[PDB]
Amino acid sequence: GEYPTVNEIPVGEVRLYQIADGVWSHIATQSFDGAVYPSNGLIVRDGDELLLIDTAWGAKNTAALLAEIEKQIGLPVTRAVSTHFHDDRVGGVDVLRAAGVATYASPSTRRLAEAEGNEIPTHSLEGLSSSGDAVRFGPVELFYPGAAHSTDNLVVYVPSANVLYGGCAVHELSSTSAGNVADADLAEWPTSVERIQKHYPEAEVVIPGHGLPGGLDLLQHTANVVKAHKN
Ligand SMILES: C[C@@H](OCc1cnn[nH]1)c1cccc2c(-c3ccc(CS(C)(=O)=O)c(F)c3)c(C(=O)O)[nH]c12
Ligand SMILES: [Zn+2]
Numbered sequence: 001g002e003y004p005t006v007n008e009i010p011v012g013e014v015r016l017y018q019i020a021d022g023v024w025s026h027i028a029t030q031s032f033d034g035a036v037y038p039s040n041g042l043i044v045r046d047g048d049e050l051l052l053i054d055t056a057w058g059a060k061n062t063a064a065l066l067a068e069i070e071k072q073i074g075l076p077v078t079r080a081v082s083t084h085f086h087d088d089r090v091g092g093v094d095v096l097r098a099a100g101v102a103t104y105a106s107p108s109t110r111r112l113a114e115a116e117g118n119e120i121p122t123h124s125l126e127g128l129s130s131s132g133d134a135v136r137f138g139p140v141e142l143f144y145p146g147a148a149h150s151t152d153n154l155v156v157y158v159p160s161a162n163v164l165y166g167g168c169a170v171h172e173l174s175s176t177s178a179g180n181v182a183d184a185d186l187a188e189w190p191t192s193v194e195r196i197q198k199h200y201p202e203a204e205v206v207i208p209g210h211g212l213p214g215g216l217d218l219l220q221h222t223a224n225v226v227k228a229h230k231n
Protein backbone atom coordinates (compact mmCIF):
# COMPACT_ATOMS: atom_id res chain seq x y z
CA GLY A 1 0.00 0.00 0.00
CA GLU A 2 2.78 2.52 0.57
CA TYR A 3 4.61 4.02 -2.38
CA PRO A 4 7.25 1.47 -3.51
CA THR A 5 10.95 2.03 -3.11
CA VAL A 6 14.05 0.10 -4.19
CA ASN A 7 14.02 -1.82 -0.92
CA GLU A 8 10.89 -3.42 -2.32
CA ILE A 9 12.12 -3.32 -5.92
CA PRO A 10 14.94 -5.52 -7.06
CA VAL A 11 16.31 -4.37 -10.36
CA GLY A 12 14.27 -6.15 -13.05
CA GLU A 13 10.83 -6.11 -11.40
CA VAL A 14 8.17 -3.46 -11.75
CA ARG A 15 5.45 -2.24 -9.42
CA LEU A 16 2.32 -0.18 -10.19
CA TYR A 17 0.71 2.31 -7.83
CA GLN A 18 -2.85 3.59 -8.23
CA ILE A 19 -2.78 7.38 -8.25
CA ALA A 20 -6.42 8.17 -9.19
CA ASP A 21 -9.21 6.56 -11.19
CA GLY A 22 -7.60 5.43 -14.45
CA VAL A 23 -4.14 6.77 -13.46
CA TRP A 24 -1.20 4.68 -12.17
CA SER A 25 2.47 5.27 -11.76
CA HIS A 26 5.01 2.61 -12.58
CA ILE A 27 8.16 2.14 -10.51
CA ALA A 28 11.30 0.22 -11.41
CA THR A 29 14.92 0.29 -10.35
CA GLN A 30 18.15 0.34 -12.29
CA SER A 31 21.89 0.39 -11.75
CA PHE A 32 23.89 3.23 -13.28
CA ASP A 33 27.57 4.05 -12.66
CA GLY A 34 27.60 1.58 -9.75
CA ALA A 35 24.60 2.90 -7.82
CA VAL A 36 20.94 1.83 -7.76
CA TYR A 37 18.08 4.27 -8.37
CA PRO A 38 14.30 4.11 -8.58
CA SER A 39 12.40 5.83 -11.34
CA ASN A 40 8.75 6.58 -12.16
CA GLY A 41 6.56 6.62 -15.20
CA LEU A 42 2.81 6.93 -15.76
CA ILE A 43 -0.09 4.87 -17.12
CA VAL A 44 -3.35 6.55 -18.14
CA ARG A 45 -6.50 4.69 -19.12
CA ASP A 46 -7.65 5.69 -22.67
CA GLY A 47 -11.07 4.00 -22.90
CA ASP A 48 -10.27 0.31 -23.41
CA GLU A 49 -6.62 1.06 -24.19
CA LEU A 50 -3.70 2.45 -22.13
CA LEU A 51 -1.34 5.39 -22.76
CA LEU A 52 2.14 4.86 -21.31
CA ILE A 53 4.40 7.72 -20.20
CA ASP A 54 8.09 6.74 -20.11
CA THR A 55 9.77 3.38 -20.16
CA ALA A 56 10.81 1.54 -17.01
CA TRP A 57 14.54 2.30 -17.58
CA GLY A 58 15.90 -0.58 -19.65
CA ALA A 59 14.83 -3.36 -21.94
CA LYS A 60 14.25 -6.07 -19.34
CA ASN A 61 12.54 -3.63 -16.96
CA THR A 62 10.22 -2.50 -19.77
CA ALA A 63 9.31 -6.07 -20.67
CA ALA A 64 8.54 -6.62 -16.97
CA LEU A 65 6.43 -3.46 -17.05
CA LEU A 66 4.29 -4.78 -19.88
CA ALA A 67 3.80 -8.08 -18.01
CA GLU A 68 2.83 -6.24 -14.81
CA ILE A 69 0.29 -4.11 -16.71
CA GLU A 70 -1.26 -7.27 -18.19
CA LYS A 71 -1.47 -8.85 -14.72
CA GLN A 72 -2.83 -5.79 -12.83
CA ILE A 73 -4.87 -3.92 -15.47
CA GLY A 74 -5.37 -6.21 -18.47
CA LEU A 75 -5.82 -3.54 -21.14
CA PRO A 76 -3.42 -3.13 -24.07
CA VAL A 77 -0.78 -0.40 -24.13
CA THR A 78 -1.21 1.21 -27.56
CA ARG A 79 0.90 4.37 -27.39
CA ALA A 80 3.84 5.63 -25.33
CA VAL A 81 5.33 9.09 -24.88
CA SER A 82 8.91 9.61 -23.66
CA THR A 83 9.36 12.88 -21.76
CA HIS A 84 13.08 13.37 -22.48
CA PHE A 85 16.01 11.56 -24.08
CA HIS A 86 17.70 9.83 -21.14
CA ASP A 87 17.67 6.06 -20.66
CA ASP A 88 15.13 6.22 -17.80
CA ARG A 89 12.64 7.63 -20.37
CA VAL A 90 13.56 5.93 -23.71
CA GLY A 91 15.49 2.82 -22.57
CA GLY A 92 13.00 0.11 -23.49
CA VAL A 93 11.50 1.87 -26.55
CA ASP A 94 12.73 -0.99 -28.74
CA VAL A 95 10.87 -3.49 -26.49
CA LEU A 96 7.72 -1.36 -26.73
CA ARG A 97 7.97 -1.08 -30.53
CA ALA A 98 8.35 -4.88 -30.88
CA ALA A 99 5.27 -5.34 -28.65
CA GLY A 100 3.09 -3.24 -30.97
CA VAL A 101 3.22 0.03 -29.00
CA ALA A 102 3.48 3.22 -31.04
CA THR A 103 6.27 5.32 -29.50
CA TYR A 104 6.33 9.12 -29.54
CA ALA A 105 8.57 11.98 -28.38
CA SER A 106 9.28 15.57 -29.37
CA PRO A 107 11.66 16.13 -32.30
CA SER A 108 14.09 17.58 -29.77
CA THR A 109 14.05 14.39 -27.70
CA ARG A 110 14.42 12.26 -30.85
CA ARG A 111 17.46 14.22 -32.01
CA LEU A 112 19.12 14.09 -28.60
CA ALA A 113 18.46 10.38 -28.19
CA GLU A 114 19.92 9.66 -31.63
CA ALA A 115 23.01 11.79 -30.96
CA GLU A 116 23.67 10.09 -27.59
CA GLY A 117 23.08 6.52 -28.83
CA ASN A 118 19.88 5.97 -26.85
CA GLU A 119 16.74 4.26 -28.18
CA ILE A 120 14.66 6.47 -30.44
CA PRO A 121 10.84 6.82 -30.36
CA THR A 122 9.26 6.38 -33.81
CA HIS A 123 6.91 9.37 -34.02
CA SER A 124 7.54 13.10 -33.61
CA LEU A 125 5.32 15.30 -31.42
CA GLU A 126 5.02 18.72 -33.06
CA GLY A 127 3.60 21.79 -31.39
CA LEU A 128 5.89 21.64 -28.33
CA SER A 129 8.97 23.55 -29.41
CA SER A 130 8.42 26.85 -27.53
CA SER A 131 8.22 27.17 -23.74
CA GLY A 132 4.59 27.29 -22.63
CA ASP A 133 3.40 25.13 -25.54
CA ALA A 134 0.77 22.49 -24.89
CA VAL A 135 -0.89 19.80 -27.01
CA ARG A 136 -3.52 17.14 -26.38
CA PHE A 137 -2.50 13.46 -26.61
CA GLY A 138 -5.32 11.09 -25.75
CA PRO A 139 -6.41 11.58 -22.14
CA VAL A 140 -3.49 13.89 -21.28
CA GLU A 141 -2.04 17.28 -22.07
CA LEU A 142 1.66 17.48 -22.89
CA PHE A 143 3.40 20.72 -21.86
CA TYR A 144 6.86 22.01 -22.63
CA PRO A 145 7.90 24.23 -19.67
CA GLY A 146 11.33 25.26 -20.98
CA ALA A 147 14.78 23.90 -20.21
CA ALA A 148 15.20 22.41 -16.73
CA HIS A 149 16.54 18.94 -16.03
CA SER A 150 17.17 18.76 -19.79
CA THR A 151 16.44 21.10 -22.68
CA ASP A 152 13.73 18.74 -24.04
CA ASN A 153 11.88 17.81 -20.82
CA LEU A 154 8.09 17.56 -21.11
CA VAL A 155 5.42 17.59 -18.41
CA VAL A 156 2.17 15.64 -18.55
CA TYR A 157 -1.19 16.65 -17.01
CA VAL A 158 -4.17 14.30 -16.63
CA PRO A 159 -7.12 16.75 -16.54
CA SER A 160 -9.72 14.18 -15.44
CA ALA A 161 -7.80 13.65 -12.18
CA ASN A 162 -5.74 16.85 -11.79
CA VAL A 163 -2.59 14.70 -11.81
CA LEU A 164 0.63 16.56 -12.74
CA TYR A 165 3.44 14.24 -13.87
CA GLY A 166 6.52 16.43 -13.71
CA GLY A 167 9.03 13.93 -14.96
CA CYS A 168 12.63 14.68 -14.16
CA ALA A 169 12.05 18.44 -14.10
CA VAL A 170 10.40 17.85 -10.68
CA HIS A 171 12.07 16.30 -7.62
CA GLU A 172 10.61 14.60 -4.58
CA LEU A 173 10.35 16.44 -1.28
CA SER A 174 13.11 14.44 0.42
CA SER A 175 15.65 15.35 -2.26
CA THR A 176 18.82 17.12 -1.13
CA SER A 177 20.27 18.10 -4.51
CA ALA A 178 19.09 18.32 -8.08
CA GLY A 179 19.87 14.74 -9.12
CA ASN A 180 21.74 14.03 -12.34
CA VAL A 181 22.38 17.48 -13.80
CA ALA A 182 24.63 16.46 -16.70
CA ASP A 183 22.24 17.91 -19.29
CA ALA A 184 20.45 20.49 -17.12
CA ASP A 185 20.06 24.28 -17.36
CA LEU A 186 20.19 25.28 -13.68
CA ALA A 187 19.73 28.96 -14.46
CA GLU A 188 16.53 28.41 -16.49
CA TRP A 189 15.12 25.59 -14.34
CA PRO A 190 13.37 27.84 -11.76
CA THR A 191 11.73 29.86 -14.56
CA SER A 192 10.54 26.61 -16.13
CA VAL A 193 9.13 25.42 -12.78
CA GLU A 194 7.37 28.77 -12.37
CA ARG A 195 5.72 28.18 -15.76
CA ILE A 196 4.50 24.79 -14.58
CA GLN A 197 3.09 26.33 -11.40
CA LYS A 198 1.27 29.06 -13.37
CA HIS A 199 -0.16 26.60 -15.88
CA TYR A 200 -1.38 23.87 -13.51
CA PRO A 201 -2.51 25.65 -10.32
CA GLU A 202 -5.20 23.05 -9.65
CA ALA A 203 -2.89 20.08 -9.61
CA GLU A 204 -3.74 17.75 -6.74
CA VAL A 205 -1.01 15.08 -7.10
CA VAL A 206 2.46 15.91 -8.39
CA ILE A 207 4.67 12.98 -9.47
CA PRO A 208 8.45 13.46 -9.80
CA GLY A 209 10.60 11.57 -12.25
CA HIS A 210 12.25 9.73 -9.30
CA GLY A 211 10.82 9.26 -5.81
CA LEU A 212 7.58 9.82 -3.92
CA PRO A 213 4.57 11.73 -5.23
CA GLY A 214 3.17 14.60 -3.21
CA GLY A 215 1.32 17.84 -3.78
CA LEU A 216 2.14 21.20 -5.34
CA ASP A 217 4.97 21.72 -2.76
CA LEU A 218 7.18 19.53 -4.95
CA LEU A 219 7.40 22.37 -7.45
CA GLN A 220 8.69 25.00 -5.02
CA HIS A 221 10.97 22.42 -3.36
CA THR A 222 12.45 21.64 -6.78
CA ALA A 223 13.19 25.30 -7.42
CA ASN A 224 14.81 25.53 -3.99
CA VAL A 225 17.11 22.51 -4.42
CA VAL A 226 18.11 23.60 -7.93
CA LYS A 227 18.94 27.14 -6.77
CA ALA A 228 21.08 25.76 -3.94
CA HIS A 229 22.84 23.35 -6.29
CA LYS A 230 23.65 26.27 -8.63
CA ASN A 231 24.92 28.26 -5.62
C1 LIG B 1 19.08 7.77 -16.70
C2 LIG B 1 19.94 8.93 -16.23
O1 LIG B 1 19.68 10.25 -16.64
C3 LIG B 1 20.85 11.05 -16.54
C4 LIG B 1 21.73 11.06 -17.84
C5 LIG B 1 22.77 12.01 -18.15
N1 LIG B 1 23.22 11.66 -19.36
N2 LIG B 1 22.56 10.60 -19.78
N3 LIG B 1 21.68 10.21 -18.87
C6 LIG B 1 20.19 8.88 -14.65
C7 LIG B 1 21.11 7.96 -14.18
C8 LIG B 1 21.40 7.85 -12.81
C9 LIG B 1 20.79 8.71 -11.90
C10 LIG B 1 19.88 9.67 -12.35
C11 LIG B 1 19.12 10.68 -11.72
C12 LIG B 1 19.01 11.03 -10.22
C13 LIG B 1 17.75 11.36 -9.71
C14 LIG B 1 17.62 11.67 -8.38
C15 LIG B 1 18.71 11.64 -7.53
C16 LIG B 1 18.58 11.95 -6.04
S1 LIG B 1 18.67 13.74 -5.72
C17 LIG B 1 17.27 14.47 -6.59
O2 LIG B 1 18.47 14.10 -4.28
O3 LIG B 1 19.91 14.35 -6.19
C18 LIG B 1 19.94 11.30 -8.06
F1 LIG B 1 21.01 11.22 -7.22
C19 LIG B 1 20.11 11.00 -9.40
C20 LIG B 1 18.40 11.29 -12.74
C21 LIG B 1 17.47 12.48 -12.60
O4 LIG B 1 17.77 13.32 -11.71
O5 LIG B 1 16.56 12.71 -13.46
N4 LIG B 1 18.70 10.72 -13.90
C22 LIG B 1 19.59 9.75 -13.71
ZN1 LIG C 1 17.10 12.66 -17.25
Ligand SMILES: [Zn+2]
Pocket: 086, 088, 168, 209, 210
Ligand atom coordinates in the same frame (compact mmCIF):
# COMPACT_ATOMS: atom_id res chain seq x y z
ZN1 LIG D 1 15.52 11.15 -14.49
